[PDB]
Amino acid sequence: AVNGKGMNPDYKAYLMAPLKKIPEVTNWETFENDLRWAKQNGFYAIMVDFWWGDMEKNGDQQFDFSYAQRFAQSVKNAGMKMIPIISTHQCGGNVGDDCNVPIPSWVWNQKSDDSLYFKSETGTVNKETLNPLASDVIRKEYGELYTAFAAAMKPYKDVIAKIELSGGPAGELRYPSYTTSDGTGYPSRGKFQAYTEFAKSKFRLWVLNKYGSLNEVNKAWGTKLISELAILPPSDGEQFLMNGYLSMYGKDYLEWYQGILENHTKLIGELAHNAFDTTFQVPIGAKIAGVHWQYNNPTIPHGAEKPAGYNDYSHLLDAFKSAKLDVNFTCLEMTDKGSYPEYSMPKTLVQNIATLANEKGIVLNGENALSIGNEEEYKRVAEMAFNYNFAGFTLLRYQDVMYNNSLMGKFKDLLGVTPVMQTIVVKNVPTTIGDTVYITGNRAELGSWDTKQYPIQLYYDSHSNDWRGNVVLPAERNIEFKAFIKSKDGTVKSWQTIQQSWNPVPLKTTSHTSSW
Ligand SMILES: OC[C@H]1O[C@H](O[C@H]2[C@H](O)[C@@H](O)[C@@H](O)O[C@@H]2CO)[C@H](O)[C@@H](O)[C@@H]1O
Ligand SMILES: OC[C@H]1O[C@H](O[C@H]2[C@H](O)[C@@H](O)[C@@H](O)O[C@@H]2CO)[C@H](O)[C@@H](O)[C@@H]1O
Ligand SMILES: OC[C@H]1O[C@H](O[C@H]2[C@H](O)[C@@H](O)[C@@H](O)O[C@@H]2CO)[C@H](O)[C@@H](O)[C@@H]1O
Ligand SMILES: OC[C@H]1O[C@H](O[C@H]2[C@H](O)[C@@H](O)[C@H](O)O[C@@H]2CO)[C@H](O)[C@@H](O)[C@@H]1O
Ligand SMILES: [Ca+2]
């Protein structure tokens, strides 16, 4: 893996449940059998949406966790684990959505202003999820929902492996900047979503709080604003994305804009921890979308990410570390293109997020953005997952492998692996002062024969005079590998004479000794 390390010893594969409730797909008996089958193919747990629209449909404090409870019961009967996603967003309307579960209708009556929803550059209103600006309403509702959920699911604490929170549209921490109705669907530029009166008002106050008075504002922005009312979000999102973002106004606007999501992250992280830490004691995470289009567009750089709220990923991730939330990213199955007209760079994006997350020490999880119908995509996921220290991978979605045996088989081999620590020993290596020995092999967990970025470093043993090291490997899979020497300058000097192999890697920890 990167930095001479191996794969993450805690890696686990999860299966995304269907969008429709199980009873709308099959019966519980078959479901339990499907779970037992998934478990046999390497899946540790099933991740599932529990919609707010279902749990608190009738009215405030009128909860119904019966479906959730019945679901967990079958997961228990099947000896599986589950990861509930407390989906406080709407189901249906997004790409590939085969459902219709809007959030409780009554929640909208809690305000007379336009503080609860979103409004785009061109006036399009969106109600897929509560506007994170309404932190007072969010604190109350999420707070009550989370605590009610914890109590209702207490009997199933043993089958809950982790809990995922919904931070916005499609359960992702972002603004609803790419939608059909707003004319911003992939792969077009996104539209800023801060045009409600309430949003304008908050930005205005934030600016004034930062500089004190209009005069200081004008001084900092180098503008000639006539009055406080002239402080507004961009009038033209396209011109703003073309070069306005470069000005001091631009930087302030984007800071505030992304800042709303960061504060939201801290808020739900606090509520979640207060509600679950004692009862469940399981990790809590949230999702970051993979807005890969318009990434390298020369005219409107990062023209899709910025409107979505993603301007500075480093700063964004700090909010996660701060809230004590693990991160779940996507687009692990895609490769870079970067050509007109999509200017898509998903892999570069993933590499960047992973690196940042690793540096900050944030537990990293991932998913595939679109359905995978070919083995090649599994390899892409494997390459990313096993070389950038991912702790978990969730496959979307259930039916794709559950009803396709050959596909399910390719996943078991490539992704449904169980990491096991093994000792690799290499004798008689003709190393000279300055050299270091690494191993690289055929599987992604071994760098896929890469000597540049992913080789796994070994350590010299001055007592037995050989090179060794404890490496994490995929249990019960066949591997081939060879050690090689790297110069002080990083040049590959030579390779082990004969290619080694382990068919397969044993399930118990032991050692593989070979000679140069
Ligand atoms: O709030 C000040 C001003 O902001 C916007 O104008 C920006 C523009 O969006 C940027 O692209 C760049 O040109 O800087 C401008 C500010 O000098 C709003 O369009 C405008 O209505 C508002 O007064
Ligand atoms: O639903 C949010 C979702 O949006 C994106 O998915 C894209 C997909 O990558 C494109 O190929 C095309 O199908 O449009 C989809 C929706 O616009 C992100 O890739 C994904 O990370 C994000 O969760
Ligand atoms: O291209 C990857 C390749 O790596 C190994 O082959 C080495 C070989 O062991 C060295 O003696 C020398 O020939 O460099 C080769 C790499 O170009 C693996 O043995 C091979 O299976 C793998 O495809
Ligand atoms: O059930 C999980 C969520 O699935 C959809 O959202 C996915 C989307 O299908 C995928 O293309 C994107 O890359 O990731 C999101 C987030 O997992 C539904 O639209 C969501 O409502 C569900 O929560
Ligand atoms: Ca409530």
Do the beta carbons of residue 91 and residue 98 sit within 8 Å?
no
Q: Known binding site for Ca(2+): residues? A: 56, 60-61, 141, 144
CA 345/CA 335 separation, integer angstroms? 7
Ligand 4 atom, smallest distance to 368 CA? 13
Looking at all shown ligands, the one closest to residue 451's CA atom is 3
Q: Residue 436 in 3-state DSSP?
A: strand
Tokens of 70: 């019945």
Name the DSSP class of 189: P
End of a domain among 370, 386, 416? 416
Examine the domain organization and report whether 56 and 75 are in the same domain.
yes
Examine the domain organization and report whether 292 and 429 are in the same domain.
no
Do the beta carbons of residue 83 and residue 160 sit within 8 Å?
yes
Examine the domain organization and report whether 376 and 499 are in the same domain.
no
Examine the domain organization and report whether 473 and 366 are in the same domain.
no
- Ligand 1 midpoint to CA 233 (Å): 7
Q: 211 to each of 145, 151, 217, 252, how far by Cα in Å?
A: 38, 46, 6, 11
Choosing from 91, 95, 128, 348 the residue with most ligand 2 atoms within 8 A of its CB, the one to mutate for a pocket test is 95
DSSP E strands in 34-183: the ranges are: 43-51, 81-87, 118-119, 125-126, 163-165
End of a domain among 388, 416, 444? 416
Burial 41-70 (b: 16+ CB within 10 A, else e): bbbbbbbbbbbbbbbbbeeeeebebeebee
Q: 188 to each of 222, 291, 304, 338, how far by Cα in Å?
A: 32, 11, 7, 14
Q: Answer yes or no: 172 catalytic.
A: yes
| Burial category of 218 from C-beta neighbours within 10 Å (exposed 0-12, middle 13-18, buried 19 and up) | middle
CA 200/CA 341 separation, integer angstroms? 32
Examine the domain organization and report whether 48 and 87 are in the same domain.
yes
- Our measurement of the distance from residue 179's CA atom to the centroid of its chain's CA atoms, rounded to an integer in Å, reads 20
How many residues in the chain? 516
- The DSSP secondary structure of 9-68, one letter per residue, reads TT-EEEEEPPSS-GGGTS-HHHHHHHHHHHHHTTEEEEEEEEEHHHHT-SBTTB---HHH
Tell me if 499 CB under 6 Å of ligand 3: yes
Examine the domain organization and report whether 254 and 340 are in the same domain.
yes
Q: What is the resolution of this structure in A?
A: 2.1
- Ligand 2 midpoint to CA 487 (Å): 43
Tokens 């709407």 correspond to what residue? Answer: 90
Supply the CATH number for residue 13's domain: 3.20.20.80
Tokens of 271: 């509520």
Q: Known binding site: residues? A: 49, 56, 60-61, 89, 97, 141, 144, 287, 292, 330, 368-369, 397
- The angle at the Cα of 314, spanning 310 to 315, to the nearest 5 degrees, equals 75
Q: Known binding site for substrate: residues? A: 49, 89, 97, 287, 292, 330, 368-369, 397
Q: Which residues line ligand 1 (CB under 6 A)?
A: 221, 223, 225, 230-232, 234-235, 239-240, 244, 247, 249-250
- Ligand 3 midpoint to CA 449 (Å): 7
Q: 1 to each of 141, 288, 344, 450, 510, how far by Cα in Å?
A: 43, 23, 25, 9, 21
Q: Which sign, positive or negative, has the C-alpha torsion 243, 245, 246, 247?
A: positive
Residue of 348, 301, 359, 354 lying closest to 329 (CA atoms): 354
Residue of 80, 73, 82 lying closest to 39 (CA atoms): 80
Examine the domain organization and report whether 385 and 505 are in the same domain.
no
- Ligand 2 midpoint to CA 146 (Å): 28
Cβ neighbours, 10 Å, residue 328: 26
Tokens of 196: 């409600």
Domain containing residue 67:
1-416
| Burial category of 331 from C-beta neighbours within 10 Å (exposed 0-12, middle 13-18, buried 19 and up) | buried
Tokens 């191996």 correspond to what residue? Answer: 6
Name the DSSP class of 457: E
Amino acid in the structure at residue 406: S
Supply the CATH number for residue 435's domain: 2.60.40.10
- Ligand 5 midpoint to CA 179 (Å): 28
Examine the domain organization and report whether 301 and 426 are in the same domain.
no
Ligand 4 atom, smallest distance to 90 CA? 21
Tokens of 401: 């492998």
Tell me if 171 CB under 6 Å of ligand 4: yes
Examine the domain organization and report whether 466 and 337 are in the same domain.
no
Q: Residue 113 in 3-state DSSP?
A: coil
Examine the domain organization and report whether 196 and 147 are in the same domain.
yes
Q: Answer yes or no: 262 catalytic.
A: no
What is the helix (H) or strand (E) element at residue 471, kind and residue range? strand 466-474
Ligand 3 atom, smallest distance to 492 CA? 14
- The DSSP secondary structure of 474-495, one letter per residue, reads ETT--EEEEEEEE-TTS-EEEE
Cβ neighbours, 10 Å, residue 255: 15
Examine the domain organization and report whether 207 and 94 are in the same domain.
yes
Tell me if 193 CB under 6 Å of ligand 2: no
CA 81/CA 78 separation, integer angstroms? 9
CA 503/CA 474 separation, integer angstroms? 11
- Total count of domains within the chain: 2
Q: 227 to each of 202, 206, 214, 215, how far by Cα in Å?
A: 16, 15, 7, 9
Phi, psi of 50 (to 5 degrees): -120, 105
Residue of 444, 454, 443 lying closest to 478 (CA atoms): 443
Do the beta carbons of residue 429 and residue 437 sit within 8 Å?
yes
Examine the domain organization and report whether 318 and 424 are in the same domain.
no
Looking at all shown ligands, the one closest to residue 174's CA atom is 2
End of a domain among 358, 392, 416? 416
Looking at all shown ligands, the one closest to residue 60's CA atom is 5
CA 245/CA 251 separation, integer angstroms? 6
